[PDB]
Design a protein around this ligand. Structure first.
Ligand SMILES: *[C@@H]1O[C@H](CO)[C@@H](O[C@@H]2O[C@H](CO)[C@@H](O)[C@H](O)[C@H]2NC(C)=O)[C@H](O)[C@H]1NC(C)=O
Ligand SMILES: *[C@@H]1O[C@H](CO)[C@@H](O[C@@H]2O[C@H](CO)[C@@H](O)[C@H](O)[C@H]2NC(C)=O)[C@H](O)[C@H]1NC(C)=O
Ligand SMILES: *[C@@H]1O[C@H](CO)[C@@H](O[C@@H]2O[C@H](CO)[C@@H](O)[C@H](O)[C@H]2NC(C)=O)[C@H](O)[C@H]1NC(C)=O
Ligand SMILES: *[C@@H]1O[C@H](CO)[C@@H](O[C@@H]2O[C@H](CO)[C@@H](O)[C@H](O)[C@H]2NC(C)=O)[C@H](O)[C@H]1NC(C)=O
Ligand SMILES: *[C@@H]1O[C@H](CO)[C@@H](O[C@@H]2O[C@H](CO)[C@@H](O)[C@H](O)[C@H]2NC(C)=O)[C@H](O)[C@H]1NC(C)=O
Ligand code: NAG
Lengths: 106, 50, 170
């Protein structure tokens, strides 16, 4: 409706008997393949991304936002737990880091 | 000639692969929309009869 | 073919030119409408040969290779269910090219979700895409993943009911 791509903003310009809209949009570019999984199996529990997606560069698993590649460590702060690993089709085994875990250890 | 609908692009679909963008383009496009016409008035008596 | 009639018709001026211009404008407007509706993608996307979409069946909406018209069964049923100076101009886009445009749109929305409409087509598994759509309407991803077989079965049943309803209602 407001240009090709994800619409960011628009600017109006007057024209003889008309209007010209300059649509400023965000276009994704330089995409890269990654291996993806619906959920992460850890300690018999299924972890799902809170806002992003699980991606793998070949050996390690990360969670990133869907519209830009920004890999982050899969922790308990950006994932949520729902059920065990027996139900979700395609769940893979990976560790889930706990930020509180070094705190009570020390 | 027979007109080409477009360039063929077979998306590499598989059940466990995703494509994530690593960059972006800020694209500005133009959209021209007419708003008004010239306001014309015709005197019917003067047009038909002078 | 009467010359005397045309000579008398010339006394009325450019009425015939006006009517021909209006009809020409309508005729080009129909082609413009078809371009605006169906030709919204400049890439002709194709589905993969293996139809592994996590239980989702699209055979009733994807084009049938066995048919020479390269239409879907639903589109084939739709085409079967629709039945002195005058000329009928053919449309600029034929039915097979319009079907090809719809096939490209279907392949894009199945293999890439909404990414192909906003830029380059980014591949994504179809259950994950459905989970994204679930999050769009405010339902968590887990609900989609846990009940994926049920959702796929309901979707296939609904598509079959659509074909049956179109085939059974005049
Ligand atoms: C996937 O990404 C991870 C994280 O960037 C990579 O792991 C790092 O690789 C560099 C390069 O040798 C090492 O110096 C780091 O020590 C690694 N970090 C960890 C935590 O192991 C990994 O190599 C990447 N894999 C591929 C195939 O690209
Ligand atoms: C992911 O981890 C689970 C548990 O750590 C694995 O499930 C085990 O698989 C072995 C071999 O099939 C069985 O003998 C065990 O009884 C299973 N344990 C449980 C609790 O189910 C699972 O195979 C792992 N998957 C992958 C791909 O590594
Ligand atoms: C992601 O991987 C797929 C498959 O490995 C790539 O698709 C191939 O691209 C090459 C480059 O032109 C083609 O010759 C092949 O025919 C493609 N294969 C298929 C099955 O389509 C794809 O290019 C990769 N994506 C990125 C961004 O590199
Ligand atoms: C993302 O894309 C931009 C272009 O839009 C890249 O910026 C260019 O980078 C090259 C090499 O680094 C320079 O020669 C150009 O002058 C840059 N152009 C502009 C407009 O700045 C940027 O490097 C890309 N970033 C990543 C991480 O891929
Ligand atoms: C997808 O749906 C189609 C049609 O709904 C299925 O095709 C049917 O397959 C059964 C068994 O092979 C046949 O008895 C029917 O006659 C077929 N119907 C039609 C219209 O051809 C198909 O099996 C489903 N699954 C896949 C993976 O394509
Ligand atoms: C993906 O497909 C492969 C076969 O190509 C299969 O072995 C694997 O189990 C599938 N994974 C899912 C999550 O469907």
């Amino acid at each position: 409706f407001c240009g090709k791509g994800y619409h960011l903003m628009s600017f109006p310009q007057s024209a003889p008997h008309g209007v010209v809209f300059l649509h400023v949009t965000y276009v994704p570019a330089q995409e890269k393949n990654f291996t993806t999984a619906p959920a992460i199996c850890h300690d018999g529990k299924a972890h799902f991304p809170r806002e992003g997606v699980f991606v793998s560069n070949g050996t390690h698993w990360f969670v990133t936002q869907r519209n830009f590649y920004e890999p982050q460590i899969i922790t308990t702060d950006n994932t949520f737990v729902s059920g065990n690993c027996d139900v979700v089709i395609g769940i893979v085994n990976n560790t889930v880091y706990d930020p509180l875990q070094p705190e009570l250890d020390s | 000639y027979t007109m080409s609908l477009g360039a063929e692009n077979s998306v590499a679909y598989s059940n466990n692969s995703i494509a994530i963008p690593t960059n972006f383009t800020i694209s500005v496009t133009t959209e021209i929309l007419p708003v008004s016409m010239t306001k014309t008035s015709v005197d019917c008596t003067m047009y038909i009869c002078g | 073919d009467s010359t005397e009639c045309s000579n008398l018709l010339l006394q009325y001026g450019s009425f015939c030119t006006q009517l021909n211009r209006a009809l020409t404008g309508i005729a080009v407007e129909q082609d413009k409408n078809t371009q605006e509706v169906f030709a919204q993608v400049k890439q002709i996307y194709k589905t993969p040969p293996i139809k592994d979409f996590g239980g989702f069946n699209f055979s009733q909406i994807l084009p049938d290779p066995s048919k020479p018209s390269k239409r879907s069964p639903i589109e084939d049923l739709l085409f079967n269910k629709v039945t002195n100076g005058l000329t009928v101009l053919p449309p600029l886009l034929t039915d097979e090219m319009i079907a090809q445009y719809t096939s490209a749109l279907l392949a894009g929305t199945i293999t890439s979700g909404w990414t192909f409409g906003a830029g380059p087509a980014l591949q994504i598994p179809f259950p994950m895409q459905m989970a994204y759509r679930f999050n769009g309407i405010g339902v968590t991803q887990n609900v989609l993943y846990e009940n994926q077989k049920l959702i796929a079965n309901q979707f296939n049943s609904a598509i079959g009911k659509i074909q049956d309803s179109l085939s059974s209602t005049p």
